Amino acid sequence: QETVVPSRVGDLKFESDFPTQETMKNMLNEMDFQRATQAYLWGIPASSIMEWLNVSRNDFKFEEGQMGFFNTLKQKQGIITANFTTPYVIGTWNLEKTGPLIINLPEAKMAGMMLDVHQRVLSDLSLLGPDKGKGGKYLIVPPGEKYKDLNPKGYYVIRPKTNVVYGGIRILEPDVDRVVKQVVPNITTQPYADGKLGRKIPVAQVPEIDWTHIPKDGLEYWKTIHQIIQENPVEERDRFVMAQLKFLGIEKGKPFNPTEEQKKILLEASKVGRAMAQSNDYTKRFTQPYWKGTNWKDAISVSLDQRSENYDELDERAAWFYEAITVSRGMKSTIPGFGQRYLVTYQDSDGNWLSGEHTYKLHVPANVPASNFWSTTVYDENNRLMIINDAGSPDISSRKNLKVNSDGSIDVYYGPKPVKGYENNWVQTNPGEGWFTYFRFYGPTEKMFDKSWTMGDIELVK
Amino acid sequence: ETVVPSRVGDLKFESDFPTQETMKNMLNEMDFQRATQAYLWGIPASSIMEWLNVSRNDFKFEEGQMGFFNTLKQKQGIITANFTTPYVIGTWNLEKTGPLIINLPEAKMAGMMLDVHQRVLSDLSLLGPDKGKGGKYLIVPPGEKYKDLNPKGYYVIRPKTNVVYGGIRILEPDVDRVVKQVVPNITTQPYADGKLGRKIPVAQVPEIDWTHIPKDGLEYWKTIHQIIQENPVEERDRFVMAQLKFLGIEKGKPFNPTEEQKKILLEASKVGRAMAQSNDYTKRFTQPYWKGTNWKDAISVSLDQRSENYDELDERAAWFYEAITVSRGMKSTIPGFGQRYLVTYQDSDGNWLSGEHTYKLHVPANVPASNFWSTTVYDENNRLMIINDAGSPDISSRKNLKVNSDGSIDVYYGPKPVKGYENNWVQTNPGEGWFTYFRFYGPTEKMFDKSWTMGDIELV
Numbered sequence: 022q023e024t025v026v027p028s029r030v031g032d033l034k035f036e037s038d039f040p041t042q043e044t045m046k047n048m049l050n051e052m053d054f055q056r057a058t059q060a061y062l063w064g065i066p067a068s069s070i071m072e073w074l075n076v077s078r079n080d081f082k083f084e085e086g087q088m089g090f091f092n093t094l095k096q097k098q099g100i101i102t103a104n105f106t107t108p109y110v111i112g113t114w115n116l117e118k119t120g121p122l123i124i125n126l127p128e129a130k131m132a133g134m135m136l137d138v139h140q141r142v143l144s145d146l147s148l149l150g151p152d153k154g155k156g157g158k159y160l161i162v163p164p165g166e167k168y169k170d171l172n173p174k175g176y177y178v179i180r181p182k183t184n185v186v187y188g189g190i191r192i193l194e195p196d197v198d199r200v201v202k203q204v205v206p207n208i209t210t211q212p213y214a215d216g217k218l219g220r221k222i223p224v225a226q227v228p229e230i231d232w233t234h235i236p237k238d239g240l241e242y243w244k245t246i247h248q249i250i251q252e253n254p255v256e257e258r259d260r261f262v263m264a265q266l267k268f269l270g271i272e273k274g275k276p277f278n279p280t281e282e283q284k285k286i287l288l289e290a291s292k293v294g295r296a297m298a299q300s301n302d303y304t305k306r307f308t309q310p311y312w313k314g315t316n317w318k319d320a321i322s323v324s325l326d327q328r329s330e331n332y333d334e335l336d337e338r339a340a341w342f343y344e345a346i347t348v349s350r351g352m353k354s355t356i357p358g359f360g361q362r363y364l365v366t367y368q369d370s371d372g373n374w375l376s377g378e379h380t381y382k383l384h385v386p387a388n389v390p391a392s393n394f395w396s397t398t399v400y401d402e403n404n405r406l407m408i409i410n411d412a413g414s415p416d417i418s419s420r421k422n423l424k425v426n427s428d429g430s431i432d433v434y435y436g437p438k439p440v441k442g443y444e445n446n447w448v449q450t451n452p453g454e455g456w457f458t459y460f461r462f463y464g465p466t467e468k469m470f471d472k473s474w475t476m477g478d479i480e481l482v483k
Numbered sequence: 484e485t486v487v488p489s490r491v492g493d494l495k496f497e498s499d500f501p502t503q504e505t506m507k508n509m510l511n512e513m514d515f516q517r518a519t520q521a522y523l524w525g526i527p528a529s530s531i532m533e534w535l536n537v538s539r540n541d542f543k544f545e546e547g548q549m550g551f552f553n554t555l556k557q558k559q560g561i562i563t564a565n566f567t568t569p570y571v572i573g574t575w576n577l578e579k580t581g582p583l584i585i586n587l588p589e590a591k592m593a594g595m596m597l598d599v600h601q602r603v604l605s606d607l608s609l610l611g612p613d614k615g616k617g618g619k620y621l622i623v624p625p626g627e628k629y630k631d632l633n634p635k636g637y638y639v640i641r642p643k644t645n646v647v648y649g650g651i652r653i654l655e656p657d658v659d660r661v662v663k664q665v666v667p668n669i670t671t672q673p674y675a676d677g678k679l680g681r682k683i684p685v686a687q688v689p690e691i692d693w694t695h696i697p698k699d700g701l702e703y704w705k706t707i708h709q710i711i712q713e714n715p716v717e718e719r720d721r722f723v724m725a726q727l728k729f730l731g732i733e734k735g736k737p738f739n740p741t742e743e744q745k746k747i748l749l750e751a752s753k754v755g756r757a758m759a760q761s762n763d764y765t766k767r768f769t770q771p772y773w774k775g776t777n778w779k780d781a782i783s784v785s786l787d788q789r790s791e792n793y794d795e796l797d798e799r800a801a802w803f804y805e806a807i808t809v810s811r812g813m814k815s816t817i818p819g820f821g822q823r824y825l826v827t828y829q830d831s832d833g834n835w836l837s838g839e840h841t842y843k844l845h846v847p848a849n850v851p852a853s854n855f856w857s858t859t860v861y862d863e864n865n866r867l868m869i870i871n872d873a874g875s876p877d878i879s880s881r882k883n884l885k886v887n888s889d890g891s892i893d894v895y896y897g898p899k900p901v902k903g904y905e906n907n908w909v910q911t912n913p914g915e916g917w918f919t920y921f922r923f924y925g926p927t928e929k930m931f932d933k934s935w936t937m938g939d940i941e942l943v
């Protein structure tokens with residue numbers, strides 16, 4: 022006898038209890054689809070790091086294991102939600118190709134970290150790191166069992182659980198030009214084999230070309246997921262995800278040459294997945310508003326090792342790493358005057374999404390709870406990069422700008438430019454909505470304690 | 484506003500930002516997809532947890548007590564069970580019993596030690612460490628408290644979860660005699676820091692209707708939640724836990740779903756089951772055992788569910804959706820030892836086996852089995868031994884069959900018996916789909932090398 026069962030995915034048809042042939046084909050297509058779609062979210066963090074490594078080796082063409090200097094707007098433009106204040110020193114490499122690598126870090130006041138491909142923190146660097154700003158030598162060891170017994174004396178031995186690692190550093194001193202010329206030249210990476218040191222690799226300077234490490238879309242996304250899997254070992258927590266991608270044509274040790282049917286499912290997974298990433302990130306259902314009555318929320322909810330008590334933070338890391346890159350102890354600092362804190366808002370005081378054609382205003386109260394500096398940077402929602410405007414000015418930082426008499430500071434966001442507020446203006450873009458992070462570099466007590474707070478952005482012109 | 488159509492509905496955006504409605508729909512579809520995939524993930528553990536719930540609340544045996552299953556009524560509730568070898572099975576939660584010893588006598592048995600997800604911890608008896616000579620197995624809880632417990636004289640088993648399973652089968656043809664000798668000498672016994680508790684004898688299964696098969700709708704989710712509570716969280720399952728969180732399922736918290744969560748879970752159970760059937764019956768991860776036939780070796784999963792670069796999520800869900808337990812021995816390549824299982828759900832025409840029709844299976848002479856062979860009919864819906872008016876769900880070589888001149892045997896399946904073949908007949912129910920397992924107890928080299936082969940089930 023036949024029987025039909027309606028469902029969210031369509032009518033399920035059975036013949037003599039067994040599913041019909043067509044229903045099985047459909048279900049296996051639905052299963053592969055759902056699996057690919059959820060894998061999309063699972064892959065957000067690694068996609069970012071992998072795509073950065075591709076740019077480094079293929080576009081910038083830096084030596085495998087070589088660091089890069091990012092400072093100018095054109096250099097930083099490709100970095101997801103980067104700031105346009107602190108000089109960056111960044112590098113990504115595959116430990117399997119480089120072998121044990123050393124990171125000779127100079128004595129200076131920097132903020133940084135060591136990350137694995139999925140962006141878990143292996144160690145902070147400089148001030149809030151083992152060296153405490155005094156400098157030191159960090160040996161990064163490949164997860165290969167070969168190097169299991171590698172523990173050389175005189176180094177901060179770091180052992181990532183994957184091959185594709187990442188290192189990032191920031192110059193915190195306001196005398197940018199002076200410090201870079203004093204610290205960067207001394208920052209270097211260096212091979213280490215058996216018991217002999219190799220040639221030191223200097224920090225190269227990033228070229229002036231169009232680029233970005235943001236996760237790609239369509240099938241490009243899967244090709245890179247496939248790449249992530251090929252360059253790294255398979256970790257226990259990811260064994261089921263691997264099982265779920267198998268029939269989509271993605272497997273470790275096998276080329277990615279998907280069939281048409283696999284492509285069709287994958288294209289859909291990328292589309293629906295992207296929408297879900299947006300949804301999970303802007304909703305941020307696992308956290309709450311930093312300040313009641315506002316849409317401001319601490320942007321970083323993920324743990325350093327991505328471990329909660331009974332689960333690994335798939336959603337928390339999916340949200341934060343969808344719009345940003347890296348995390349560290351400092352980035353979640355509760356130490357007065359050290360590290361940084363990040364608050365984000367995607368809407369105005371009416372809960373409406375911020376769009377580049379309207380005029381907005383953010384009232385920054387006096388005595389901002391920050392020791393080094395504070396800033397507001399605008400990013401485009403679509404790419405989550407510093408919005409490219411006519412002015413060539415992505416943000417506003419504690420610098421040369423109009424300051425109210427009560428010591429408050431008003432920031433304006435709009436297409437054109439408010440009169441008298443030319444120093445405190447942010448040029449948006451017609452119907453190209455955006456958002457922004459309010460950076461706290463060297464956050465004090467009143468920011469942690471919620472003694473000092475701000476309101477959401479208010480709409481001005483229609 | 485922009486709109487992008489998709490396989491899950493039209494996606495709407497306001498200035499690039501997803502609309503409020505779209506975000507809600509995405510989170511909803513996200514939870515649905517996750518719960519649907521978790522359903523498949525939990526197939527194995529569900530079968531065992533449900534059995535332990537029956538042992539505790541329906542049979543009401545002690546936590547840690549074994550059960551004797553032998554009559555059709557006793558085994559009826561066991562997923563794809565045989566009606567040939569007496570069973571001695573039990574399931575318990577180590578955290579509740581504490582270290583538990585399995586006092587195994589000397590005998591020709593086939594059994595295993597499984598964890599909640601049905602990974603093999605060890606084989607028992609003949610193909611096990613005691614080699615049929617008998618012995619004592621000490622199953623230790625995963626807690627860090629007993630992390631050093633390693634007393635001499637026992638076979639120390641270290642499960643990774645709390646809910647474990649123990650199964651044994653009497654292989655001897657003299658069932659009435661061997662049962663009386665062996666089962667009375669089988670017991671489980673608590674071990675607490677050196678001292679032994681009282682021995683727990685095997686209890687006969689009460690005459691009542693039961694089944695450990697996974698439940699449907701929200702009943703399945705309540706049990707998945709229970710599995711979570713009763714066992715620690717393992718690394719490989721950390722993301723499944725993350726995905727279940729917003730559906731109202733977390734360890735350490737009660738299961739009290741919101742109206743919205745229940746709607747998602749019900750659909751997930753419905754779509755998850757259909758996917759379970761599809762994954763199982765299609766078996767795209769394997770192929771026919773004998774070329775040109777629908778027969779396939781029913782077991783593809785590895786003892787520890789570990790393949791080279793992934794854990795066998797699909798192979799696990801396929802075989803455990805239609806069966807229970809695994810061991811080195813149901814995958815034996817050792818001649819005359821262990822068992823092997825072949826399955827078919829379709830006739831030679833590729834059509835689903837349905838009870839309203841009459842079929843015939845031609846079993847060649849010299850079946851490659853040193854102990855016995857059989858064909859058991861199971862219903863597709865519950866995957867339990869077929870319930871017919873005849874009270875006979877199978878045909879085994881132990882029975883009184885009408886052998887052929889050349890020694891071959893003709894088995895018939897139908898709602899009505901075939902002229903002079905009642906002894907080689909298994910009654911089926913019209914309109915009800917069925918499938919069958921062909922068991923090889925004591926498989927010979929002719930089975931492994933494919934030298935001996937059998938055709939598909941013919942219609943009419």
Ligand SMILES: [Mg+2]
Nearest residue numbers: 102103104361
């Ligand atoms: Mg930054």
Ligand SMILES: [Mg+2]
Nearest residue numbers: 132133349351
């Ligand atoms: Mg930092």
Ligand SMILES: [Mg+2]
Nearest residue numbers: 563564565652
């Ligand atoms: Mg059996």
Ligand SMILES: [Mg+2]
Nearest residue numbers: 593594810812
């Ligand atoms: Mg066995």
